[PDB]
Amino acid sequence: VTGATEHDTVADIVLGQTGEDVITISMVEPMSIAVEDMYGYVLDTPTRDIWPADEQIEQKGDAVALYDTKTSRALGMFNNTVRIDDLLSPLLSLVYRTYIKGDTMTMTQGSLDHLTLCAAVDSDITFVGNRMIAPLPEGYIPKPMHRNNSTMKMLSLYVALKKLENFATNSYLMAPDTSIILLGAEREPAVNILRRFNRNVSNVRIIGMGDRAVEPNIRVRVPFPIDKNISADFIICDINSYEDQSFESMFSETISVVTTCASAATRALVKINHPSEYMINSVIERLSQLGGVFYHTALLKTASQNPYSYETYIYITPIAAAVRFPFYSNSAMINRYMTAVADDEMPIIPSIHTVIKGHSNTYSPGLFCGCVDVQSAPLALSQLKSYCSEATTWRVDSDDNLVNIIARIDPARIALEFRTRSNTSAYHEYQRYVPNGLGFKVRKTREFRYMHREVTFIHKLMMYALIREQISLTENMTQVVSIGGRNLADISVVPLNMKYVVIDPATRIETLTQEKKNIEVQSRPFQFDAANMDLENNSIYLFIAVIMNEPNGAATPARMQMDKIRNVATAMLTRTNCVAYISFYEAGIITRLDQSTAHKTIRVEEGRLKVANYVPVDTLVEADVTLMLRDIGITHEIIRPSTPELIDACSNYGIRLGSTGGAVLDVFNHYSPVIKLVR
Amino acid sequence: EGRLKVANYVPVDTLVEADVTLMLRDIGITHEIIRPSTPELIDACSNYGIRLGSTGGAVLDVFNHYSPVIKLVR
Ligand SMILES: C[S@@+](CC[C@H](N)C(=O)[O-])C[C@H]1O[C@@H](n2cnc3c(N)ncnc32)[C@H](O)[C@@H]1O
Ligand SMILES: C[S@@+](CC[C@H](N)C(=O)[O-])C[C@H]1O[C@@H](n2cnc3c(N)ncnc32)[C@H](O)[C@@H]1O
């Protein structure tokens, strides 16, 4: 951000247009994941006892209101931009091309690698012996399996149904059961894949049934004709409403679908196109009328689904004893649909900027793409630090005088910059690069409008957006003390006008570069002793991922975290205008993760939530914290990031959700809530 | 096994005073914890012609302080 060179009224820099044979820009970045991580799912479970009449009418009002006023236009734009078949096609292509060359050996009969191979190729695969693939006969080239967008999702759903009944299974075979896929299935590839996958089994009957089915599937309409009997062990239903109807018609259609599926098999997975609290709870109520049988239901969402899809799957199975808590309220997987309210502004399309300006804030999020003369490269690189924290500079040939530059606009860098009027940079360091210090790369460069970030980065961005909205809503405030802030991570929320203070025992000290940007750093620890707590009358205090750990790198028990919360709450009393924000993992996420298999980085170890290679930390119970803050006597509030925060993060930052990250993001956000302690 | 066996009853478990008091502060009712004292011991031993024993004298001080009464009033 800062340097030893002082700029003033510097002339702007124009980047010339680069040919399409040197720099090419794509829309959505493909994502690379291990083959075993395509088949995941995350559980969500009901947490309510009764469905009273006032709740019924309010939920109906909240649901019908979001039908005519369709889902947010920005979410619709991202959902159809980031598909799933394209988001993982290179992996399947790699598998198929490896298979054809004769490089596929030593995989288990029913492993997920075998299932992926059955989805990647068309021909039948035989085992010359257990745990080895027979080489294909000479002269045989099998065409790659042409599957649609919703095929890998069906494979993951089949895996989930084959995994719920036995959580310790390592193979997925159905001897000698049967299954049917309730789906229109114009040209169903999943039936072919599953038939090719269970061939060694003695006899399993699997087939699709739907409205527009072709051979070998059967063309029927749901509910089934009265003069026919259908019966199977598994149901994987996903029925869509292509035509436009009212709320009542889709209600009746989905009620009939759920009843028929639940009466057709011992286990069923049914897709809900419009998952609302009222709709899901009405489905739950109708489940009880099915002959007085007790049904156990839990919301599900696979890891091979469209990351931005608000559609969630329901799971239905009979249970010996009726579940005490059958109803859902403010669940993780419904709040992606509730909070997807139509926008008050048009979606912002990322753009390419070709002109570099000196301290000019007229830049929308996007990329800096262009080429400049080698002599102006240090100057342009010194002037674009005010917007971007990274830049990839390279040259084509040593006989070429122009230098190609790519850089992404970073809102955190904008927030840290522009806090003052001073313009300093290490322009003296960059002139050491001319002319051969800027790299060479003959090959074409491929950069994406929406790059990839891990799940925790997405969550932090959404929570920062939420806190920034909250802080901007208030008024008459002097500073924002970031207790947990390390390396100025929380600066994305503080307004440029007001101060910002960091109290972290481990942070770099450089007094001049912190004076030049109006920040103050205190490398002393934050003592949670209400007698010595240094809370200004008019300030905002941020506690982000700091309560849950120790500054030396250790984890803290739940009672210590509760004591810290109590200390900050009590010491925050006897103040005029004080606001504090605290975040903590909740105890409801342990129940969901220990039943699921989509855990990639957010994992559970011995009851402590192992998140992103950090030490395993225990969770807190919402009821206990709420009771403690009720007894203390301060105005508390549990707030969680929602869909608009996700959209704003993924739009300002040119980053999009991953295939595996989409399933876990619903649950993760609901169980890392934020406390708003105000006066 | 962590329970109180009194008068050959079925052993029963014990409540924490902090939890009980904390519960009544949220509910919103006036509450108090009352305990019998030495004058109550004298009155029981005078109005009824009874006296303490040897094994009962030592244990009764502990028995009083941990069998309290909650006086909820409006
Ligand atoms: C998602 S589309 C099918 C897309 C593709 N075949 C696939 O594998 O997902 C859902 C299908 O369900 C069928 N469908 C719609 N309403 C139905 C109903 N009421 N009863 C039975 N099938 C229905 C439609 O024909 C439609 O093709
Ligand atoms: C998990 S990081 C959180 C980073 C940042 N707060 C954020 O937005 O996520 C927590 C950091 O806070 C620091 N820290 C731990 N205890 C602290 C305390 N009691 N007071 C101030 N800082 C602390 C630690 O050095 C640790 O690196």
Numbering used by the authors:
A (entry chain A): 379 to 1057
B (entry chain B): 984 to 1057
Pull text from the paper:
Here we present four in situ and one isolated cryoEM structures of the trimeric spike of the cytoplasmic polyhedrosis virus, a member of the non-enveloped Reoviridae family and a virus historically used as a model in the discoveries of RNA transcription and capping. CPV has two functionally essential components located along the icosahedral 5-fold axis: the RNA-dependent RNA polymerase (RdRp) inside and the RNA capping turret outside;25,27 a trimeric spike is attached to the latter. Each spike monomer has four domains: N-terminal, body, claw, and C-terminal.
Serendipitously, turrets of some adjacent viral particles “kiss” one another in our structure, connecting their open ends and forming a dimer. Comparison of sub-particle reconstructions of turrets before and after spike detachment shows that the binding of SAM and ATP to the turret protein causes global conformational changes. The detachment of the spike clears the mRNA releasing channel and enables nascent mRNA to reach the methyltransferase (MTase) active sites and finish mRNA capping, allowing the mature mRNA to be released outside the capsid (i.e. into the cytosol). In the turreted subfamily of the Reoviridae, represented by CPV, the turret protein is a multi-functional protein: it serves as the capping enzyme, the signal sensor, and the mRNA releasing channel on the five-fold axis of the capsid.
